[PDB]
Amino acid sequence: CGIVGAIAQRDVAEILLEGLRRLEYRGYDSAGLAVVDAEGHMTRLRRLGKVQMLAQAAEEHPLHGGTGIAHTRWATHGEPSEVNAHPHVSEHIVVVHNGIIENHEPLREELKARGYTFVSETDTEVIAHLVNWELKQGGTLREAVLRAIPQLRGAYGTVIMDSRHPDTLLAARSGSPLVIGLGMGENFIASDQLALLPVTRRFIFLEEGDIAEITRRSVNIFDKTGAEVKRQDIESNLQYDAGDKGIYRHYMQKEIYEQPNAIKNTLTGRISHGQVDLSELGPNADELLSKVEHIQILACGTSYNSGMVSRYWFESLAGIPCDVEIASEFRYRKSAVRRNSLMITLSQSGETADTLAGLRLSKELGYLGSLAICNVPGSSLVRESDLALMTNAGTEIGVASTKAFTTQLTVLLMLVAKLSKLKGLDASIEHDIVHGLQALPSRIEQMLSQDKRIEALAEDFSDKHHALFLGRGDQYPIALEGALKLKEISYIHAEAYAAGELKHGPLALIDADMPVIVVAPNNELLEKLKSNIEEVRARGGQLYVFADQDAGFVSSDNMHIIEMPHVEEVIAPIFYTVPLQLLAYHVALIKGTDVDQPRNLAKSVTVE
Amino acid sequence: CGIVGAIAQRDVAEILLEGLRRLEYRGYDSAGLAVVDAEGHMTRLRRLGKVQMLAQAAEEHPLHGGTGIAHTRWATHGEPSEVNAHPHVSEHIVVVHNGIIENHEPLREELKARGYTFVSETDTEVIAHLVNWELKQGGTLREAVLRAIPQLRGAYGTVIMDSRHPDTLLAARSGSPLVIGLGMGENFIASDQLALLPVTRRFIFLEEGDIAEITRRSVNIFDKTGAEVKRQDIESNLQYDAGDKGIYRHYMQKEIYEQPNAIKNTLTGRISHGQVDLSELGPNADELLSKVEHIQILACGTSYNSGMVSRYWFESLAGIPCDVEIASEFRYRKSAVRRNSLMITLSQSGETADTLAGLRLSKELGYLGSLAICNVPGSSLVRESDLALMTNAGTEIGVASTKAFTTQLTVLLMLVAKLSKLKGLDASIEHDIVHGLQALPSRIEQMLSQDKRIEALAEDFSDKHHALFLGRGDQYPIALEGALKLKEISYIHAEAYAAGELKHGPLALIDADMPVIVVAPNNELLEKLKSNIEEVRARGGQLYVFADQDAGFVSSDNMHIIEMPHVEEVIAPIFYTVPLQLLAYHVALIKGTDVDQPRNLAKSVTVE
Ligand SMILES: O=C(CO)[C@@H](O)[C@H](O)[C@H](O)COP(=O)(O)O
Numbered sequence A, B: 001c002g003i004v005g006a007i008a009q010r011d012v013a014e015i016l017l018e019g020l021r022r023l024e025y026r027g028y029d030s031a032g033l034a035v036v037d038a039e040g041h042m043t044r045l046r047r048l049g050k051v052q053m054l055a056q057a058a059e060e061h062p063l064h065g066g067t068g069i070a071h072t073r074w075a076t077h078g079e080p081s082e083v084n085a086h087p088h089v090s091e092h093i094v095v096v097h098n099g100i101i102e103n104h105e106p107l108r109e110e111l112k113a114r115g116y117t118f119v120s121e122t123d124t125e126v127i128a129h130l131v132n133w134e135l136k137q138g139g140t141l142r143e144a145v146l147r148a149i150p151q152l153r154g155a156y157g158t159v160i161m162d163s164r165h166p167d168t169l170l171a172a173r174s175g176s177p178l179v180i181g182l183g184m185g186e187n188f189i190a191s192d193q194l195a196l197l198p199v200t201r202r203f204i205f206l207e208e209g210d211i212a213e214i215t216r217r218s219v220n221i222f223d224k225t226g227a228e229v230k231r232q233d234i235e236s237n238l239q240y241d242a243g244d245k246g247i248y249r250h251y252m253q254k255e256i257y258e259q260p261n262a263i264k265n266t267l268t269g270r271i272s273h274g275q276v277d278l279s280e281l282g283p284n285a286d287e288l289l290s291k292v293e294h295i296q297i298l299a300c301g302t303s304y305n306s307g308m309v310s311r312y313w314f315e316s317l318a319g320i321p322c323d324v325e326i327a328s329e330f331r332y333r334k335s336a337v338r339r340n341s342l343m344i345t346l347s348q349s350g351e352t353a354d355t356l357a358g359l360r361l362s363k364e365l366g367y368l369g370s371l372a373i374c375n376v377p378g379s380s381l382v383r384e385s386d387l388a389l390m391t392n393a394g395t396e397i398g399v400a401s402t403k404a405f406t407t408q409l410t411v412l413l414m415l416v417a418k419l420s421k422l423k424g425l426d427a428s429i430e431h432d433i434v435h436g437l438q439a440l441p442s443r444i445e446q447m448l449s450q451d452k453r454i455e456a457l458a459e460d461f462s463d464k465h466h467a468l469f470l471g472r473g474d475q476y477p478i479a480l481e482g483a484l485k486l487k488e489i490s491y492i493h494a495e496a497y498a499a500g501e502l503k504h505g506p507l508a509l510i511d512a513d514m515p516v517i518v519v520a521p522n523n524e525l526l527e528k529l530k531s532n533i534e535e536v537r538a539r540g541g542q543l544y545v546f547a548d549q550d551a552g553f554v555s556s557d558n559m560h561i562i563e564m565p566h567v568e569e570v571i572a573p574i575f576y577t578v579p580l581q582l583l584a585y586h587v588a589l590i591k592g593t594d595v596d597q598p599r600n601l602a603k604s605v606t607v608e
């Protein structure tokens, strides 16, 4: 979800709306804002649907005033409803929050029994009634919030307002991000600096436990207790472009086309003279990485798929045992820890709840250390890991990851090179990987010029409701990732298989209507994969084969061959992802689906 | 595929047909037979389709004579065609074969260049033209076959006939099973004794390299060279019932209902006084199993799914690191071998080509040892493993495994108990597992009495083309197995997910038409799973929850709760499989699909 707050001299409603538009990719099931004018007349508006529903409403009933808070949300529990939309109130108290109040249930009973009525089942109302109760003796809002916060347990961020005293906002960071934007004679707050770029580039990042008292002219941050702490303001490092689509129709589209440049940025400072350079990790990292006998990778969704590709690399190239597991399963099992095991999390956001819970469990279980591969500076996974290797792909706004996945593989391959060197293996392994990486942005630039043939193919998917994706070896998780892209944004029921598994049952699914998408680099598995493709064609499947130009496939009625330029084997999985990203994009366009904000979802699963 | 041969005084055509009916589950894309009368007039008949197509043809054109061979086949390459149906000929030579002639291609060119014409691309014709060439100087058929066999490389079984001399059949076992049935004044051969039960129970199992010269009155087996070897005939140990359906409409149905009795048979001799007893493994097995620090399980399809369940058991109960991998991916990767690693294959048939290739690779890679868990005495995996633990489930004929899967889990759980004892862990782990196992046939008998409610539910799937299955923890591979059953035999596009993965993309698939099947034991993951189910319901999914009676689910419009009796947690995955087997069965009935012989498949993938 996304939180924006604002305390200014000028009206803030437009600012709060522009803030929600920018955080929309985090939840687009509902949104609301509440604005108090200097006279304390508070106007609250809440709508079901995308932020535009709220903006439209606001245009009919405009909201005057300098103080306000706003929210946009991914509704998990129950069908989304306007009754549950934020902000929530308790008379004069008004509240928005992100994250979770773990002890929702006892606090609720206790407030009920003190005489409160609950209009919703949200945690937000719990926080509202509680602060109302804390104020009932008559102190300052800050005083009540200091009393209130210790009674709340869980991982959450909240902004709180007393409409009787529109001069001050209170915010409390306790598990979920909050950041204050510093203006001139006005201040703002948000769950992500991205929402505040249009009015300020100067930010104070609250640390866990911080409570902030914010007026037009002052920012006072206090610790756990009531003691003031010092927090440095800094200049934004995000791009000025941020959540602008530029010439692109979709964020996803932009992010697919940005991949050559994002990859270059992932590589900056990290390749030198035919070798990989990960000295940014510092003068104790080699000692650690040198002791690694086993790698455990933990991730969700597309970040799990890149870990699955790298497993083939780590075992075959660095000779290191590597397991990859989805984090929602790992975090609850009673696992057997390998000797000398490195925990690697992959996460674009660095905030995914299950991945984060895996990392926290791993400390307790005695792994050797942990390495974060992350796209977000200063996210939870980065600060709680022993080591971090940032992807440098830039902000990613498309709910479906494209550039995050391919820059993750780039970094994995670097770490494969580094480990192969620390183990004293053939120097050629590192050389060949570095040759790969060095060609990679140009190879991707070159694959993107196949976009028009893929766009033409996508029209065939117009009447389709199913698809199968097939790959073998290190291309098998590339099939997984293409099937996930396709089903997530076009809603075709796409399913991936390692090609060797069909004759054990799934081949029953093939009839004359089933399209089957395959990635076919010209490598030692080509003949084995060709056999699989023939098994599919023999039962009437419609084949779409992205194959190397010299693979020798013969095009026909049910065999559509999209010829691919040559590529270094070591980077072949990254290259073959690109056509599947384009195909998913184009099919979604044909289907008329919301490519950037697919239904039932939002980006980054930060609450379990 | 399935091979039958016969050399008798009486007509053999009916016998050869009855033989193919019994081997049909091995391939039902085409079949053929060739029969020579005492005058050497040879009649060959071949039909596309199930064996009944051939039998019907035979009823129109009956085939007299005492000598013949027959085949039924799973067509892999190309659309099945009558031109490719076996037997194949080269004038007077007639041949059927199973397996693969790896050097098909050079032998073919060489025969072409000697003047042969090829009517098909089958390996069978290669063998036929080659034996024709070997006879062209004029020796005995046996002589030519001894010259021919060394020129063939690969894993295959073949029976060969010269219609000019109907007095003798030649067969050669070189990688694929052959067995001779001994009659009285007549002999038979088949690729599996199951085909010969109706005329004999006395068998000679050929060993690899064996060449057999078979007449009405004699069986001479020769080794690699021309030297005679001794092979003992034995009495069949299969059940008299074998490939009879009895009162059951389908083999699959029978095999589902047999599970309590099959499980009892898996347990016989192996539980004693609250402890597991695996002393059948012998007086060097404990030494081995005692050194195990890591377990690698290799299997395909449903046998991979049982390995995935046991991974949760091995790590959480015996504290042993366990990886599970599909064998088609394992056999071609350059893997990193763990120290002290036990290779475990799971296979009903004991002959699955990829699983077998994994086991063979593991010898070469230096694992500690290998353990086969198999349903077939004397199959390849059993004889090439260091240790074997048979499931004792009895012959399984349904192309889709039911009893094989559940008896595999039973044996896995026993081995978990044994390892937990060898490691000196809490004695209660073994006790609780043995309490589980001891209740298990009755718990299964009790689940089978829920069949009528499941049959009623299945009618809802009549208009459905998709389904999702959800599970967490050790029930997650139970969802995988239920989705595989459903898609294999009903052709609904069923897909399994660990419940925690939906919000990372797959939840986009949920609309008002999607049925979602969930297994919900009353265990520590119930509340976490309930959250997932609510996420699905909130977007309009149709929930089918097989839940413990005390799980507290509330039934409604899109929430169908099938209440399950209580069960011991340790056996909960085995118990919750049963309702998904029944549901798949009943949905297939509603859809009017061939439950026992699903399209595009056959049972056991014995050629890659
Ligand atoms: O982007 C997608 C789908 O295309 C998601 O599957 C994620 O990859 C995921 O939810 C993990 O998120 P991060 O941990 O990478 O932030």
Ligand SMILES: O=C(CO)[C@@H](O)[C@H](O)[C@H](O)COP(=O)(O)O
Pocket: A503, A504, A505, B300, B301, B302, B303, B304, B346, B347, B348, B349, B350, B351, B352, B355, B399, B400, B401, B484, B485, B488, B604, B605
């Ligand atoms: O029965 C099924 C499908 O329900 C197959 O997926 C197999 O389990 C498989 O082909 C492995 O065969 P076996 O190795 O167990 O003989």
